[PDB]
Amino acid sequence: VFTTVDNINLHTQVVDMSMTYGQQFGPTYLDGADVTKIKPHNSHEGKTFYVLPNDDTLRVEAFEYYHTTDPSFLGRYMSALNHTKKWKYPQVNGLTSIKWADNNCYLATALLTLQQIELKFNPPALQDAYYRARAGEAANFCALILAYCNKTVGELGDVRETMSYLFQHANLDSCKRVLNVVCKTCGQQQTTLKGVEAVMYMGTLSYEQFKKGVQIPCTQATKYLVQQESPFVMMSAPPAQYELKHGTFTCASEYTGNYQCGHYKHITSKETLYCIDGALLTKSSEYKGPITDVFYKENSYTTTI
Numbered sequence: 001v002f003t004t005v006d007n008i009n010l011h012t013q014v015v016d017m018s019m020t021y022g023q024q025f026g027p028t029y030l031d032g033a034d035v036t037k038i039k040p041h042n043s044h045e046g047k048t049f050y051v052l053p054n055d056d057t058l059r060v061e062a063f064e065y066y067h068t069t070d071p072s073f074l075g076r077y078m079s080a081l082n083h084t085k086k087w088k089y090p091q092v093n094g095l096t097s098i099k100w101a102d103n104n105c106y107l108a109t110a111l112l113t114l115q116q117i118e119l120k121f122n123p124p125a126l127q128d129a130y131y132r133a134r135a136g137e138a139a140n141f142c143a144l145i146l147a148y149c150n151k152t153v154g155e156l157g158d159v160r161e162t163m164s165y166l167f168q169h170a171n172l173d174s175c176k177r178v179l180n181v182v183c184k185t186c187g188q189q190q191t192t193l194k195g196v197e198a199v200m201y202m203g204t205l206s207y208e209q210f211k212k213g214v215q216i217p218c219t220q221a222t223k224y225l226v227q228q229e230s231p232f233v234m235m236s237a238p239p240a241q242y243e244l245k246h247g248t249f250t251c252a253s254e255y256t257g258n259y260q261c262g263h264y265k266h267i268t269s270k271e272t273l274y275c276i277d278g279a280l281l282t283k284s285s286e287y288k289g290p291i292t293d294v295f296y297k298e299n300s301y302t303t304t305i
C-alpha cells in the first residue's frame with residue numbers, strides 16, 4: 001500500500017495480513033477512520049494511508065504542508081474529518097453553506113464569510129482546501145479549521161475567535177492600520193498596528209463610527225482611524241440590536257440566544273439582503289436584529305482633518 005502525511009508525496013510499502021496496521025506503520029488512519037486497531041483486510045492494495053510522521057523526511061513533509069510540528073495535529077484533524085465528511089454542504093445564493101449538524105452554526109457563518117473576503121492562507125493544506133471549498137467540497141476545509149483552532153465537533157464556537165485564529169495563519173503582512181488617540185491632558189499619541197490587529201476591532205459594528213471616533217479611556221480619550229491599508233475590515237461588538245442597510249456592508253454575523261448556547265445566522269448584502277441559516281435562505285429589503293460582527297470592504301483609506 002501507500003502511506004503519506006501530505007497526500008502530495010506517497011511512499012509505497014507492504015503489510016502482513018496477520019499484523020495490525022499500528023505495529024507495522026504506527027498510528028494509521030484511512031478516510032478519517034483509525035485503522036490502527038484494524039488488521040489489514042487485504043481487500044485494498046495500493047490504497048493511500050495517513051500516518052503520523054515517523055521519519056525525518058516525513059516530519060519535514062508534514063510541516064511544509066501544515067506548518068506545525070504538533071504530533072497531536074494529525075489525530076485531531078482526522079477525527080474532525082470523520083464527522084465533516086458526512087455533513088451536507090448545500091449551495092445557497094451561489095455560496096457554499098453547511099446543513100446544520102453538531103452545532104456547526106459558527107462554522108457555516110465563517111465558511112460563508114471567507115467566500116466573500118480576500119484572503120490567502122500560508123499553510124498549503126489550508127489554501128488547497130480553501131479552493132476546494134469554494135467549488136463545493138468543504139469537508140477537509142472545515143476539519144482543518146477545527147484542528148487549527150484546537151476545537152472539536154459539537155464544541156461551541158465563536159465566529160470572531162475562529163476568524164482571528166484563521167487570520168493568524170493567513171498572509172496579512174501587507175495590511176496596516178494607523179491609529180491616533182488624543183487626550184487634552186496627555187496630548188496626542190499615534191499608534192501603528194499591523195497584521196491581524198490591523199483588520200479587527202472590538203467595540204463597534206460601524207466602520208463610520210470607527211472613522212468618526214470611539215471613546216477609549218486614557219492613563220476619556222477618543223480613538224479614530226487615520227489610515228487603513230487592508231483588503232477588508234472586521235468590526236466586532238457584543239451582540240446587540242442593529243439595523244443593516246442594503247449596500248453599506250459586505251456580510252454580517254447574527255447571534256441570537258444565550259451566551260455560548262446561542263445560534264449564529266449569516267446576513268449578506270447583494271441586490272437585496274439575504275439571510276442564510278444553514279440550508280435555509282431568507283430575503284428582505286432591510287434587516288434589524290442582534291448583530292455581533294460586520295465585514296466591510298476596503299483598499300486604502302486616509303483620514304481628513
Ligand SMILES: Cc1ccc(OCCN(C)C)cc1C(=O)N[C@H](C)c1cc(-c2cnn(C)c2)cc(-c2cnn(C(F)F)c2)c1
Pocket residue numbers: 156157158159161202238239255257258259260261262292
Ligand atoms: C457561541 C460562543 C461560543 C464560545 C464562546 O467562547 C467565549 C470564550 N472564549 C474566550 C473562549 C463564546 C460564544 C458566544 O456566545 N459568543 C457571542 C458572540 C457573545 C455573546 C455574548 C452575550 C452576552 N449575553 N448574552 C446573552 C450573550 C457576549 C459576547 C461578548 C462580550 N464581550 N465579548 C468580548 F469582550 F470578549 C464578547 C459574545
Ligand SMILES: [Cl-]
Pocket residue numbers: 067068
Ligand atoms: Cl508557520
Ligand SMILES: [Cl-]
Pocket residue numbers: 067122123168169170
Ligand atoms: Cl502559518
Ligand SMILES: [Cl-]
Pocket residue numbers: 248249250295296297298
Ligand atoms: Cl463594504
Ligand SMILES: [Zn+2]
Pocket residue numbers: 009010011057061
Ligand atoms: Zn517522500
Ligand SMILES: [Zn+2]
Pocket residue numbers: 067122123
Ligand atoms: Zn506558517
Ligand SMILES: [Zn+2]
Pocket residue numbers: 083102153
Ligand atoms: Zn457528528
Ligand SMILES: [Zn+2]
Pocket residue numbers: 082083084086
Ligand atoms: Zn457525524
Ligand SMILES: [Zn+2]
Pocket residue numbers: 103104105106262263264
Ligand atoms: Zn448552532
Ligand SMILES: [Zn+2]
Pocket residue numbers: 183185186187218219
Ligand atoms: Zn491621558
